[PDB]
Design a protein around this ligand. Structure first.
Ligand code: H3E
Length: 335
């Protein structure tokens, strides 16, 4: 089992000494290591489960990162740098530059207090820049979520907050990078039927209509809402209920998408508003703009961008290249 080979003090590839576990996901774990052959530099090492699905993703990710890292050697577009990879007791291990906390862990460890709007603006801009680089290179990420957006540096202050009695982290600089290219898919490759983590999954994915770069835009809009509220507006683990929540937040789905779904197993959604699930969706969900916490124009600008990212029709949906020009980002450009 992986626990036999990922302990503090273990040495991987005769050079990488484990000093901490940074976290786990379905894929395995990421550990922080000292690289004794690079002058003691700390790196991150992703230790992949020895299971075919994950091994296959890791091999794919290695090829995608080789491509992205060679194309953008300065990481101008903020995709994490892979340093090398190796095998350890049958596990694929990928070595990366050491980044800071995931945006998920940062918000979670703060009791789900939302990010400041000024930080959201900077983060959103960088996420759009980064993922647009993928889209410029005939790639779609497919698994964008706060866990896969990491802070570059550990540029925060921490203290034991008297009020809550737990420790709070406060961000100083919000710069990010994008990680996890194990689901990333080239335009000309086989597209998996099911992609994305449910809460970030676009309607064309749910409806098996075909997906491409626009499904990433949908996921980013969901991420930005989460950063702003501290929670998802789609609190569900069921596809039909997910669609009903979309309908309540965004309005009815377009006829053309309903009529294409040859898997019209969900259809007007066939949904009882008066059932337990129906009552839950009406309580939990409301039109998008009602989630705004301020009527100040910068909040309106953020919500306008989110609404465009959550456009049902993936053709009409704003592209990332267009998103970068949106008014929300003007504060970044006001020299
Ligand atoms: C999926 N993936 C992560 C990297 C990755 C790459 C470089 C990294 O420098 C630091 C981390 C780091 C910080 N928290 N975590 C926990 C975690 C995050 C995301 C998902 C699971 C665990 C990792 C890190 N991670 C490459 N693929």
């Amino acid at each position: 089992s992986m626990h036999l080979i990922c302990q503090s003090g273990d040495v991987l590839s005769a050079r990488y000494e484990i000093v901490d576990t940074l976290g786990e996901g379905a894929f395995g774990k990421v550990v922080e290591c000292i690289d004794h052959k690079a002058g003691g530099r700390h790196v991150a090492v992703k230790i992949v489960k020895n299971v075919d699905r994950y091994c296959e993703a890791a091999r794919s990710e290695i090829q995608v990162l080789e491509h992205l890292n060679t194309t953008d050697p300065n990481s101008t577009f903020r995709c994490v740098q892979m340093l090398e990879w190796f095998e350890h007791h049958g596990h694929i291990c990928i070595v990366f530059e050491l980044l800071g906390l995931s945006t998920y862990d940062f918000i979670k460890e703060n009791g789900f207090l939302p990010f400041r709007l000024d930080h959201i603006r900077k983060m959103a801009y960088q996420i759009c820049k980064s993922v647009n680089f993928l889209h410029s290179n005939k790639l779609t990420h497919t698994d964008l979520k706060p866990e896969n957006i990491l802070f570059v540096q550990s540029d925060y202050t921490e203290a034991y907050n008297p009020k809550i009695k737990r420790d709070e982290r406060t961000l100083i600089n919000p710069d990010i990078k994008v990680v996890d290219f194990g689901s990333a898919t080239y335009d000309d490759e086989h597209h998996s039927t099911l992609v994305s983590t449910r809460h970030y999954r676009a309607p064309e994915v749910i409806l098996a209509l075909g997906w491409s770069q626009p499904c990433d835009v949908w996921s980013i809009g969901c991420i930005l809402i989460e950063y702003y509220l501290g929670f998802t507006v789609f609190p569900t683990h069921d596809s039909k209920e997910h669609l009903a929540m979309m309908e309540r937040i965004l309005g009815p789905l377009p006829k053309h998408m309903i009529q294409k779904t040859r898997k019209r197993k969900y259809f007007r959604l066939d949904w009882d508003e008066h059932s337990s699930a129906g009552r839950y969706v009406s309580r939990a969900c409301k039109p998008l703009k009602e989630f705004m916490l301020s009527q100040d124009v910068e909040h309106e600008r953020l919500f306008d961008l989110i609404q465009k990212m959550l456009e049902y029709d993936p053709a009409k949906r704003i592209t990332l290249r267009e998103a970068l020009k949106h008014p929300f980002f003007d504060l970044l450009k006001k020299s």
